[PDB]
């Protein structure tokens, strides 16, 4: 069957160093950077607990423990030794050079051994994870731009950190190893509970927690359409979808915020989160969002363009006459900023 790496908690310091080495130097290839981040998670949660989590996600993947060898290196299952050795070599070369230029005096928080380097690495992963959780498609480059602002302080400490290539590594990992989405969820839930409130942990938790709302975006926009009193919500073809609209909101009502992860998890009920069974409703919901100015750069499907345009015109006229109560809508801060151009 299929296999994947876990790393025992006894090697937490060593995997921490490897994460730091990824950030610390300008590397040619970041292919397995995301997998190293995952290895840190496994030391945090415990390798046997990871096997449980994967099994429970519906995967029969078998975990294989990381070992050590000397040329001290980590032997990580499914990660080419040449890659790990090259990351380490390039980091150590860079450190030797910089250490000498600074006469042996480099602050801890600029070194690859700084304890928050795995968390920093995982913050890039967290942004890719919340991108993935959303029912609204955005380009990877958009997310990369966001990572640059969010991790501006990390970039001052680690000015050779290659965010776009690290981002691509996490993007690929979540596409190829779907079970590691479930592992990431358990880590985020665990850290949400155990966070010391440090800067790195707080950033991770704040990004991670956005995944729930991201999954529910279109349903939240639906409520916004009603709070906007969009009269196209009364169109005959929309009223006809009442049982389907009911199924959709019954889902989130009964499940609570966890339902936001169904898209990410590729659950059989994920389509509901994208309003797949109620296309006319969806068109009014999207049109209303467009009219309010909160839809951003939406490249997704508009099932009924006439309904969309009508809903958009109506929202827009209410907006232009200052008849929208923007405080009461339940907008995100970014949506508020987009619609009103102040926060």
């Amino acid at each position: 069957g299929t296999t994947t790496a876990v790393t025992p908690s006894s090697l937490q310091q060593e995997i921490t160093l490897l994460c730091g080495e990824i950030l610390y130097a300008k590397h040619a290839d970041y292919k397995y950077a995301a997998e190293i981040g995952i290895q840190y998670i496994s030391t945090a949660l415990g390798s046997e607990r990871v096997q449980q989590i994967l099994r429970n996600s519906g995967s029969e993947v078998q975990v294989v423990l990381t070992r050590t060898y000397s040329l001290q290196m980590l032997d990580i299952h499914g990660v080419e030794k040449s890659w790990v050795e090259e990351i380490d070599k390039e980091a150590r070369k860079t450190m030797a050079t910089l250490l000498k230029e600074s006469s042996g005096n480099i602050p801890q928080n600029q070194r690859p051994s700084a304890p928050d380097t795995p968390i920093i690495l995982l913050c890039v992963g967290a942004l890719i994870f919340t991108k993935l959780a959303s029912t609204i498609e955005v380009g990877l480059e958009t997310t990369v731009r966001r990572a640059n602002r969010v991790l501006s302080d990390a970039l001052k400490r680690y000015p050779r950190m290659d965010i776009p290539k690290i981002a691509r590594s996490f993007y690929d990992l979540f596409e190829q190893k779907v079970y590691h989405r479930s592992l990431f969820i358990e880590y985020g839930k665990a850290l949400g509970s155990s966070s010391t409130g440090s800067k790195a942990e707080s950033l991770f938790v704040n990004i991670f927690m956005q995944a729930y709302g991201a999954g529910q975006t279109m349903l939240r926009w639906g409520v916004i359409a009603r709070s906007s009193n969009n009269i196209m919500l009364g169109h005959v073809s929309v009223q006809a979808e009442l049982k389907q609209v009911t199924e959709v909101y019954d889902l989130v009502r009964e499940m609570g915020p966890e339902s936001g992860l169904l898209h990410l998890r590729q659950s059989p009920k994920a389509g509901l989160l994208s309003l797949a069974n109620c296309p006319n409703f969806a068109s009014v919901v999207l049109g209303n969002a467009s009219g309010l100015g909160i839809i951003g750069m939406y490249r997704g499907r508009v099932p009924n363009t006439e309904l969309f345009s009508a809903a958009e015109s109506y929202a827009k006229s209410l907006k232009e006459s200052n008849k929208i109560n923007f405080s009461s809508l339940g907008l995100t801060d970014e949506e508020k900023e987009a619609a009103e151009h102040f926060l």
């Binding site: 709302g213 529910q216 349903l219 939240r220 639906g222 409520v223 359409a225 009603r226 009269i231 196209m232 919500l233 009364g234 169109h235 005959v236 929309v238 009223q239 979808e241 009442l242 609209v245 009911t246 199924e247 959709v248 909101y249 019954d250 989130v252 009502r253 915020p257 409703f281 006439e306 345009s309 009508a310 015109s313 109506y314 339940g330």
Partner: peptide, 28 residues
């Protein structure tokens, strides 16, 4: 975030249908 029932999101009834139809018609 508190989600209402679907029947509290849509505008149901003949009157609501006629209102939406009229607005749509006004847009040519």
């Amino acid at each position: 975030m508190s989600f209402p029932e679907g029947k509290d999101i849509l505008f149901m009834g003949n009157e609501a249908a006629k209102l939406a139809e009229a607005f749509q018609k006004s847009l040519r």
